[PDB]
User: What shape does this take?
Amino acid sequence: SMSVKKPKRDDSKDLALCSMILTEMETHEDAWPFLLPVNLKLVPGYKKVIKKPMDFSTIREKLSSGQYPNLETFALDVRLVFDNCETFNEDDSDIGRAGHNMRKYFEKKWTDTFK
Assistant: This one.
């Protein structure tokens, strides 16, 4: 509360470490469904159904231009990528499996880096 603060957690490496994690996700073999925005002209249903589209390229631009105020807003956009994938794709499809694999990959790097 006012003039009463918890000890200062060092956040000075967060930017660099989120960039490294994002690099690792970009270079995973199963990243191909997620590298670029879904083409809303060519994919029927996507625009109406997925209220907040997200992809790795868009996360990378936001990261590079100071649009994440902290590491939790970064993790929210990564998870949005996988939540959207589950909304639109069957679990037993190549894309559906890609999304489960990538979420698992991400959540392990996140825990090992920050928890």
Remarks:
- The radius of gyration is 16 Å.
- The first helix runs from residue 14 to 26.
